[PDB]
Ligand binder design. Structure first.
Ligand code: PTY
Ligand code: PTY
Ligand code: SLB
Ligand code: NA
Ligand code: NA
Ligand code: NA
Lengths: 120, 612
């Protein structure tokens, strides 16, 4: 199971970043995929996941209504569009996948390299 | 021994007195002179963790945790023993969960430091595995009694053997529990939360206590999906009690006990009976006015009933009033308690809904006055229809003697309501100052509160708050599970599909609450419907402060609906009258309460004025 991130870097307050995760090595539909966040000196926090919840994608309380997770199940890609980025979102975002479809992205078995997101 | 049988009593009482002293020292050292204490709040919360867990142990021993016996009571006695035995086994499983996953948290947090106290964040996590050892004792004793009354089926030596075997396995060879891991047998996919919900309702209607059923549901969910996460979610069982707002629950209870017991609730009644009582049916006006004045000190309707019902019914029956109205008005006027600040229902709502408690109090202030006015008008109409004789006016000297006697008491609401509104006191500091003032009143201005009596009041306040502490700390555990699975979003989609306008959503929520409160108690419902109804209300745009006031008023009606009404039972006990008579006599007074509910539902700007 391989996952590689794409996109990131530094933006201002409200830069509307677009993280991406191209993943391979499993069945895209049977595996719950998602993103979690680790701050520079804090415990990891789950952000979002698709295929985890039964009906709608799971969103964290502090990323709700301003983060949208989308699937691209033709090139096996997961996108996370972030809008209205507060200066408290400066962290590292890791793409994760897991065979158990439950909305706990910070405890998922597999994890990607991660990307730095800085908000100034 | 006996000092060990009465151990939580003298430990929780002493810790509660210490916490009270620390908080009052903080308040004085911060207000009287500018010298704030940095170590007061965190030390108080650290003490309160132990106090709450000791209260939970007392509740386990007394078997006084809230359950739903609507369908359990109807079972045949032969079939009523298997279910109770299974309930006891489930409680044992929950206690073992507590012990194991509290010891893990205690041993995993030896490096985190409490900055203000300069101590490790394990002395706060030591409480969960430690007090649980008492809970496993008090549980077994509580089981040994049940077998003496033919209420269980398993001899209480097999239960002891099972308990010690399970504890030894948990702390020696935990891997033997992997057989019970349900994820090795069932693969329900992403729709497991709806299988641990219908299995949580089956438990909730078979007589399992609410606090334990929530924990069993969490255990089932984490066993079916993935066990590895339950080590990190179990933290919610401890830091939920490390809340400064929650400290206002055992204090606002205590200030409702130190006034009935110190005789301060009779001087208020004398003042109300002197000022009012010479009107058309004025012995009901004194009832409602006494309830209104006492609602500024207490926060429970049952406390109001138990403290004023005998006096009110006696005063009303000394004037020829009928039994039905005597029992009905004194039950309908209870609900003014949990509406006017302080109130414990709104504190619980603010804890569950993460809302401000001061704003909840200010919002609920106005509906209390509206309900008081409506009850007075309905009582006046009823009395004038029945032609009750107007009582002679009190002399201008008695009306002043009663006021002069009950003068320092009347200043208690000004400390609370005028302290929170003015911003001088936070609700917890308001609770502490109110308790201190009640102690001064009953011990140094009225001279009716001893030290043994005060300690007994502290002990019973701890016991009463311990049955809500368990439900708080398990509903916090279950809420994150139910909120990551986005169940409330699906239910809200269904509700919007069936009810279009938001007003229809409010009407349907109110109808559901009215139907459920007839058979379910007002405390075994605030932890069952609110955790899922709050996110739906947030989604459909309903203000959460207004929603809290509305739900509190909707559930205070539920204690008067006579399939299951706590206020009716309390009034029947204190009035020496049948429950049926009270139930029939409260029907005329349900109408003004419904009118108040309607006019606050369709005029939300009435509620949200003082907060805004
Ligand atoms: C006369 C008849 C009377 C019948 C009496 C029945 C008695 C049994 C009742 C249940 C006992 C309490 C269970 C809940 C508390 C569990 C305590 C913690 C156990 C635990 O952590 O074990 C892990 C493994 O077990 C696990 O993986 C946990 C699986 C079990 C959790 C609970 C599952 C639901 C309950 C089962 C219901 C169905 C059966 C009912 C009989 C650790 O192992 P590790 O290696 O992962 O950790 C070590 C490395 N960190
Ligand atoms: C105070 C105690 C509780 C008060 C409320 C109930 C009072 C009366 C009790 C009787 C039961 C009433 C209905 C409640 C059902 C709860 C569980 C809903 C899930 C369910 O059965 O349907 C799911 C379908 O998902 C869907 O599309 C439907 C999802 C609906 C979710 C509703 C969850 C409510 C849980 C209760 C919270 C309190 C009330 C809040 C409104 C999964 O179907 P399945 O897996 O069973 O399929 C069976 C085939 N294999
Ligand atoms: C007596 C009982 O079982 N439940 C009652 C609870 C408890 O007194 C609780 O311990 C403190 O809220 O209080 C009420 O919610 C209240 O007056 O607001 C009414 C409810 O009927
Ligand atoms: Na009150
Ligand atoms: Na009353
Ligand atoms: Na009822």
């Amino acid at each position: 199971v391989q996952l590689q991130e794409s996109g990131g870097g530094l933006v201002q307050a409200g830069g509307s970043l677009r993280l991406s995760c191209t993943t391979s090595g499993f069945n895209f539909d049977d595996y719950a995929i998602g993103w979690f966040r680790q701050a520079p000196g804090k415990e990891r926090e789950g952000v979002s996941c698709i295929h985890c919840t039964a009906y709608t994608p799971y969103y964290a309380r502090s990323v709700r209504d301003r983060f949208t997770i989308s699937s691209d199940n033709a090139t096996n890609t997961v996108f996370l569009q972030m809008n209205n980025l507060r200066p408290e979102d400066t962290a590292v975002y890791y793409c994760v996948a897991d065979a158990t479809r439950y909305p706990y992205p910070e405890f998922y078995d597999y994890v990607g390299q991660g990307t730095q997101v800085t908000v100034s | 021994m006996k000092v060990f049988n009465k151990l939580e009593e003298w430990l929780g009482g002493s810790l509660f007195i210490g916490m009270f002293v620390i908080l009052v020292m903080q308040i004085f050292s911060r207000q009287i002179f500018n010298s704030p204490l940095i170590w007061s709040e965190e030390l108080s919360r650290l003490i309160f963790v132990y106090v709450g867990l000791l209260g939970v142990s007392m509740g386990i021993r007394s078997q006084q945790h809230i359950m739903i016996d609507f369908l359990y009571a109807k079972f045949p006695k032969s079939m009523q023993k298997i279910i109770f035995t299974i309930i006891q086994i489930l409680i044992l499983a929950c206690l073992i969960f507590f012990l194991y996953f509290g010891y893990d948290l205690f041993i995993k947090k030896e490096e985190i430091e409490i900055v203000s106290l300069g101590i490790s964040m394990k002395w706060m996590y030591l409480a969960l595995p430690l007090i649980t050892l008492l809970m496993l004792v008090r549980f077994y004793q509580a089981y040994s009694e049940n077998y003496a009354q033919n209420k269980v089926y398993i001899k209480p030596i097999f239960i002891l053997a099972l308990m010690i075997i399970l504890v030894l396995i948990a702390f020696i060879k935990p891997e033997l529990f992997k057989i019970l891991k349900l994820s090795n047998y069932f693969d329900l996919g992403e729709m497991t939360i709806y299988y641990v919900l219908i299995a949580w309702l089956v438990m909730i209607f078979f007589g399992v206590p609410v606090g334990w059923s929530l924990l069993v549901a969490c255990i089932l969910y984490f066993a079916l999906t993935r066990w590895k996460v339950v080590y990190f979610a179990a933290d919610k069982l401890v830091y939920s009690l490390d809340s400064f707002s929650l400290l206002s629950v055992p204090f606002f209870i205590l200030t409702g006990i130190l006034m009935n017991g110190a005789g301060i609730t009779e001087r208020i009644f004398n003042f109300a009976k002197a000022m009012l009582g010479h009107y058309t049916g004025g012995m009901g006006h004194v009832n409602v006015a006494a309830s209104l004045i006492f609602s500024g000190m207490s926060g429970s309707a049952i406390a109001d009933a138990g403290g004023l019902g005998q006096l009110e019914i006696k005063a009303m029956r000394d004037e020829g009033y009928d039994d039905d109205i005597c029992g009905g008005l004194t039950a309908a006027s209870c609900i003014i308690g949990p509406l006017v600040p302080p109130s414990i229902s709104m504190i619980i709502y603010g804890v569950i809904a993460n809302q401000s408690i001061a704003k909840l109090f200010l919002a609920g202030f106005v509906p209390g006055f509206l309900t008081t006015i409506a009850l007075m008008i309905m009582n006046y109409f009823v009395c004038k229809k029945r032609g009750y004789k107007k009582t002679a006016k009190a002399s201008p000297k008695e009306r002043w003697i009663a006021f002069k006697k009950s003068f320092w008491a009347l200043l208690t609401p000004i400390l609370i309501i005028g302290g929170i509104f003015s911003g001088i006191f936070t609700p917890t500091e308001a609770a502490v100052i109110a308790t201190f003032y009640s102690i001064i009143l009953g011990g140094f201005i009225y001279k009716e509160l001893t030290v043994k009596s005060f300690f007994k009041h502290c002990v019973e306040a701890v016991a009463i708050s311990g049955v809500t502490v368990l439900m708080i700390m398990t509903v916090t555990f279950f809420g994150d599970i139910i909120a990551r699975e986005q169940v409330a979003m699906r239910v809200a989609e269904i509700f919007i599909k069936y009810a279009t306008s938001p007003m229809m959503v409010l009407v349907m929520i109110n109808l559901l609450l009215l139907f459920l409160g007839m058979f379910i108690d007002a405390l075994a419902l605030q932890f069952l419907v609110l955790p899922m109804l709050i996110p739906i209300a947030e989604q459909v745009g309903i203000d959460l402060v207004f929603f809290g006031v509305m739900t509190t008023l909707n559930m205070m009606i539920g204690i008067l609906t006579p399939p299951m009404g706590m206020a009716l039972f309390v009034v029947a006990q204190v009035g020496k009258m049948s429950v049926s008579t009270v139930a029939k006599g409260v029907l005329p007074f349900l109408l003004p309460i419904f009118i108040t509910l309607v006019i606050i539902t369709i005029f939300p700007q009435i509620i949200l004025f003082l907060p805004n």
